[PDB]
Amino acid sequence: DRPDLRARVAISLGFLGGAKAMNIVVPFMFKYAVDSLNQMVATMATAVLIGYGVSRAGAAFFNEVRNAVFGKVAQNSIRRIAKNVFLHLHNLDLGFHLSRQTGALSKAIDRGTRGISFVLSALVFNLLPIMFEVMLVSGVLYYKCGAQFALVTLGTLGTYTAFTVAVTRWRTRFRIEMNKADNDAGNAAIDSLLNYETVKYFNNERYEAQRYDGFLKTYETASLKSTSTLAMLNFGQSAIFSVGLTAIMVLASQGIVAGTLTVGDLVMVNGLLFQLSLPLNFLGTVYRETRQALIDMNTLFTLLKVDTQIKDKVMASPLQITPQTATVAFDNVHFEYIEGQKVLSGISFEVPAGKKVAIVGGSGSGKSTIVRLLFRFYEPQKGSIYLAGQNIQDVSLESLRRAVGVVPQDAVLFHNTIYYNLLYGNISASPEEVYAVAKLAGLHDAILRMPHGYDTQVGERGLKLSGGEKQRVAIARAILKDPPVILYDEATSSLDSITEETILGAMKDVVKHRTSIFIAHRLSTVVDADEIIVLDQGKVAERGTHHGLL
Amino acid sequence: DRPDLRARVAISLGFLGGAKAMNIVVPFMFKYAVDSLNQMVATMATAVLIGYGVSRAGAAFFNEVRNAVFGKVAQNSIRRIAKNVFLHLHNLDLGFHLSRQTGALSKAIDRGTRGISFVLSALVFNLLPIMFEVMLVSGVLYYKCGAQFALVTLGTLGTYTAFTVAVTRWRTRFRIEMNKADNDAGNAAIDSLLNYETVKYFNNERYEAQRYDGFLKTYETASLKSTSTLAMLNFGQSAIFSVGLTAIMVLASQGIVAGTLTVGDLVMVNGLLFQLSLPLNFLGTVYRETRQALIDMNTLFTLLKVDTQIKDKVMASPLQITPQTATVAFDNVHFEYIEGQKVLSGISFEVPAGKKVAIVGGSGSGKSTIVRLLFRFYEPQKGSIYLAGQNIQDVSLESLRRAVGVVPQDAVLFHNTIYYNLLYGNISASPEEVYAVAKLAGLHDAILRMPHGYDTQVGERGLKLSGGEKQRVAIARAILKDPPVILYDEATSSLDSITEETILGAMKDVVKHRTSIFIAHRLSTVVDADEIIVLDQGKVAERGTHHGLL
Ligand SMILES: Nc1ncnc2c1ncn2[C@@H]1O[C@H](COP(=O)(O)OP(=O)(O)NP(=O)(O)O)[C@@H](O)[C@H]1O
Ligand SMILES: Nc1ncnc2c1ncn2[C@@H]1O[C@H](COP(=O)(O)OP(=O)(O)NP(=O)(O)O)[C@@H](O)[C@H]1O
Ligand SMILES: [Mg+2]
Numbered sequence A, B: 001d002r003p004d005l006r007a008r009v010a011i012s013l014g015f016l017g018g019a020k021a022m023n024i025v026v027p028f029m030f031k032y033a034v035d036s037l038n039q040m041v042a043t044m045a046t047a048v049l050i051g052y053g054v055s056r057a058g059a060a061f062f063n064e065v066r067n068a069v070f071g072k073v074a075q076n077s078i079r080r081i082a083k084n085v086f087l088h089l090h091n092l093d094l095g096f097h098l099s100r101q102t103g104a105l106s107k108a109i110d111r112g113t114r115g116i117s118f119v120l121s122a123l124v125f126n127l128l129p130i131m132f133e134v135m136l137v138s139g140v141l142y143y144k145c146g147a148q149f150a151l152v153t154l155g156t157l158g159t160y161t162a163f164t165v166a167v168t169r170w171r172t173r174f175r176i177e178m179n180k181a182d183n184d185a186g187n188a189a190i191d192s193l194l195n196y197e198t199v200k201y202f203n204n205e206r207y208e209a210q211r212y213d214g215f216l217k218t219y220e221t222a223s224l225k226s227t228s229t230l231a232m233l234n235f236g237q238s239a240i241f242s243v244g245l246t247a248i249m250v251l252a253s254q255g256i257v258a259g260t261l262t263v264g265d266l267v268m269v270n271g272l273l274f275q276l277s278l279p280l281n282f283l284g285t286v287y288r289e290t291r292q293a294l295i296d297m298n299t300l301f302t303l304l305k306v307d308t309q310i311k312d313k314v315m316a317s318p319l320q321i322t323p324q325t326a327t328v329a330f331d332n333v334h335f336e337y338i339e340g341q342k343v344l345s346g347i348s349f350e351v352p353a354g355k356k357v358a359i360v361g362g363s364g365s366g367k368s369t370i371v372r373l374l375f376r377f378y379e380p381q382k383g384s385i386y387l388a389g390q391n392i393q394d395v396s397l398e399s400l401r402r403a404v405g406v407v408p409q410d411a412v413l414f415h416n417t418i419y420y421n422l423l424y425g426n427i428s429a430s431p432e433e434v435y436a437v438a439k440l441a442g443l444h445d446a447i448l449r450m451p452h453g454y455d456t457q458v459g460e461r462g463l464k465l466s467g468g469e470k471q472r473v474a475i476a477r478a479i480l481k482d483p484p485v486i487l488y489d490e491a492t493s494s495l496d497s498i499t500e501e502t503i504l505g506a507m508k509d510v511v512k513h514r515t516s517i518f519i520a521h522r523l524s525t526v527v528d529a530d531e532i533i534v535l536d537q538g539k540v541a542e543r544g545t546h547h548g549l550l
């Protein structure tokens, strides 16, 4: 609906048309020059030669301005689809991204974008202009000279395309065979290199060389066959074009002898047919990978269509929240991660406002399931969840996400500065608040002990950090978010004792005048809970204070 | 020194020359046809047109037969260098392959071979033929018409190549910028995908999209600049060729007006210059990656030149060996794997013929160093090694390798059938001996319990196997080799007890009437040794039988 893109497309098509027109005009110019020189007074011939030169220069200019304009508009379009698909991809369920246990999604999306761009560019720069050229050639040859010339040029193009189509598959089979042979040789080389200790242990240094030589023959025959068939295809194309040129020139000469049309008219049709024939090898060399581009586009489309999982509901009502009330509770919670495997069943808690509640389990069965469920990653098909009297599934999503904050079991940090990771908790927060939160988290000492401090580079490719710093960063982010409800899922892996008391004190500071749900495996960390819940074989069996022991 | 390759090269060059000659003849043919039709009787014109067609067809045929012949000879050469470099690579020291802790060597060697082939093919198919074309054009234009035509065509080529060289670098800088921007965008996408849990934890789903959009601009500007500069370069080329054609045709017309040369001579020089100009864009599009091919070739050459490490000595005397004698011993052995770190020092053993000697150490300091040294992987610069009174360093290498057999600490198996791995111990061994050895090794029961048996596929990509089967395979290979001296370096990792007694019985069968050096960490495995050697802090301190305790 943007007129700018329509204007650019129209300009590109008009430039294509003008370019084809000038390409058609050029042989007319040459023929007029030849006739003028045959008649002889040289001023007219010089003018026609200058016209020939400027016409072909203008044709090239038109081609290239069309190329530049369409490149700009297409690349802008690629920027729009890529930006949209990125946001769309970051909306699916957690299960899909857990299944996609690789970073191949970025490669897939970029490959699809490049493939779409390549397909569009190849189509608009080859298919339409070549068909337009053929139509203009046929029309001008039929009107200027006769029907026979148009018929013979159409026949020449028909036999050329038929031959190319026939040879393409008979060559791609050999290409596939060579590719498989090369892969086999590479795998054999990998195995021989890997078994080098055993190779040295025995006398087998020449046997591996002989095997590699045999594999080199297996690749050799296919390579030779592919080269030979490529040469044969090129011969077919060139000979077809030669026969076409010879026939058209013979027809022009036969017309000349009768005196129907003037001498010097065969050279124009020769040049015109040849300039028609020029781009048909560029056509093939770009069609070579169009199938792969289309395959990549299909893969991207399928990945976009895996988006059938949508946890968002309709009628997004607002969430009424306040520091008081907000009594998180359950009602007959049953849920299964694995189809038919009751990981969690019969769970129902009761957390009053301002009270710290800690849940403790064994090796683990649903300990992190509470964190997953309360943040609305999965739907508890049985029972319900209550938050200030509001069901999780009956309220607008991202507002619920903003209401409750979580300190995760694990931690991942963006490949940026520490200050950016701290600020990630609240984008519109003042830097002074960020510094105060970081100081409150008991991390500023490690920041000043860092090689740089706030601006030090931390990431996967940055300097490595232990678990304690990541826990401090997560706690500080939770503080910066400032949620009325906090879910601290402390990591199962232990750390230094002093760090444990520091994080315990930090969490005690967090709990002040708010609701906190603690997950831990150490009794000393949960002695301060108002009520403690014990999880056994996926069920709740024990509730109460620390006086219940274990 | 093979006349076949010289004959093929001569045939290819002769076909190239004939092809260029025919390409030169074609415009002469067209000019003769034009003059014949201008004079008019049509039989001569028809004959000249037929000659034009057959001449251009023959020129294409000559090009392509040259292409096929040189492809064959070059690919054969590639097969020779690859086969030689594989054998040369499997001759270096163990340290180089330990340092090369990747399978990238095969990729490097294949990439280098393809790069050498590509460089040779591009050179022989573009540089020489184009220079020959230019020389023939200049000569024929100077002799047939005059010096001015040759001068102007040489000037046109000079300005074309100067413009292309000038624009190449100014475009490759933009190419580098675009490549870096694309890499940055991909890395940002990787980070955003990896931090998806933290993205969902907060409200930051649109912020990542905005950042990706900014990166898309950073890539966008470079892409647009590269497309624009490519279009500008193409305009420069086409306009230069247009000016050249216009100038040459104007000169031909000026010559025609004076009557010095006949009408219809401008079209021949036009077509001749254009067919000269035809391949100069193929030239650039193949030169695009010649630098990368040369870089790969340089990397392969450097890797071949890392071969300065050569443990082989001169004056390879034969090794006198017999089941008797062969008393392996040391004399003040000191060696350091890490420069300045005395891993092994002051080691001197004494193993009489037919006696089983076991060495036992702590966590490990030089336990496998004995296995490494006796098989001549490293040189003990201090002291000497005695084997039947023959120094290891003063005898031919691979015969010493064949004399002594080793059961390794670890094990690796070729990605082939079990029968092939068993036969790898002795290539020229009868299959019946292989079956008898396998049965003696206590493995045929597991073979018949296997899904297939002898022909089952076992490898990295095959079915996985535990350590016990690998140990049985190694023992059976050692039996098939049948060495007078055996060094059994039993793995530090333990296995099933019953498997331990079975392998102990197998080793006891091995020791019969031969010399065996055992390495183990279990006292029960070494109680049967004639004398036991205890290694402490890299030195020998305790020697004797089992009565010495520990
Ligand atoms: N995406 C998933 N699909 C299926 N099962 C899952 C998935 N994620 C986790 N589980 C299972 O959920 C069970 C309980 O998980 P969790 O709540 O983390 O307790 P835990 O991991 O066993 N104890 P802890 O290590 O302290 O968290 C585990 O045994 C997992 O096998
Ligand atoms: N290629 C090498 N370069 C440098 N140091 C090495 C190399 N190989 C081994 N070492 C070191 O030398 C020591 C001797 O290793 P080795 O002779 O295998 O006994 P071990 O590894 O100590 N114990 P075990 O597991 O019973 O073999 C090891 O501790 C290694 O760290
Ligand atoms: Mg957990």
Ligand SMILES: [Mg+2]
Pocket (backbone or CB within 6 Å): B367, B368, B409, B489, B492
């Ligand atoms: Mg060892």
